[PDB]
Amino acid sequence: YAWNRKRISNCVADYSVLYNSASFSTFKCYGVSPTKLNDLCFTNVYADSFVIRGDEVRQIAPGQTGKIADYNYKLPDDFTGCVIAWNSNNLDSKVGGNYNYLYRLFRKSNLKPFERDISTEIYQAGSTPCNGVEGFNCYFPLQSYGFQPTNGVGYQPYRVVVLSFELLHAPATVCGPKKSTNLVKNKCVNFNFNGLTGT
């Protein structure tokens, strides 16, 4: 429910170090090809990381449905970026079960894409406004998970991060390790000015 938003800017990115770091569960990029990621210059690449259950990881896509995909995280329909998910058990194997996580069960209004669901306070489910007693027709939205090593392999905890860089918005700053070249004039040549390509 509380997903961080770590901005990145004014540096050089890479993708080659994100191929052999670990055999991730999924490295899937909507709107961009993951092989050409080190060729174009982006505009204020974002970063949002969290942990979810291994079977609902399918919910991370632009336009799906599911408890996380509805009440926790909403991607835009025109999402343009990569999602990287990898199984986190060796570092998240709690024999007693780690219950320091929370997600929503019911919300009055569903979230528009890219909205922090900070409404993490008491919630009302049905009739008889209960004023915070969680009785009948009042079910708490914030529920924990079942992450333990004895838990099902599809139900294991997983660490996910979504690189969501918007393109063609401002002077780009995040293009990778490509090397510059001298400037030549009065010849029909191929150029590349911060992604702006042509002849």
Partner 1 sequence: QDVVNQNAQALNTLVKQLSSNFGAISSVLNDILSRLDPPEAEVQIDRLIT
What span, in angstroms and rounded, lies between the C-alpha atoms of 95 and 148?
A: 5
Contact window for partner 1 (CB under 8 A) among 27-35, 94-102, 145-153, 179-187: 27-35
Residue of 36, 58, 116, 169 interacting with partner 1 (CB under 8 A): 36
Q: Does 63 participate in binding partner 1 (rule CB under 8 A)?
A: yes
What span, in angstroms and rounded, lies between the C-alpha atoms of 23 and 15?
A: 14
Q: Does 10 participate in binding partner 1 (rule CB under 8 A)?
A: no
Residue 193 C-beta: closest distance to partner 1, Å:
12
Burial of 3 (C-beta count, 10 Å sphere; 0-12/13-18/19+): middle
Token duo for residue 187: 């010849």
Q: Does 197 participate in binding partner 1 (rule CB under 8 A)?
A: yes
What span, in angstroms and rounded, lies between the C-alpha atoms of 145 and 30?
A: 28
CA distances to 107, 121, 145 from 92, rounded to whole Å, are: 29, 27, 12
Residues in region 79-108 near partner 1 by CB under 8 A: 80
- Between 34 and 146, CB nearer to partner 1: 34
Q: Which DSSP state fits 69? A: H
Residue of 40, 60, 68, 162 interacting with partner 1 (CB under 8 A): 40
Distance of CA 122 to the CA centre of its chain: 26
Q: Does 109 participate in binding partner 1 (rule CB under 8 A)?
A: no
Q: Does 177 participate in binding partner 1 (rule CB under 8 A)?
A: no
Within 47-165, residue ranges assigned H as helices are 67-71
- Between 158 and 165, CB nearer to partner 1: 165
Binding site for partner 1 (CB under 8 A): 31-33, 35-36, 39-40, 62-63, 77, 80, 167-168, 195, 197-198
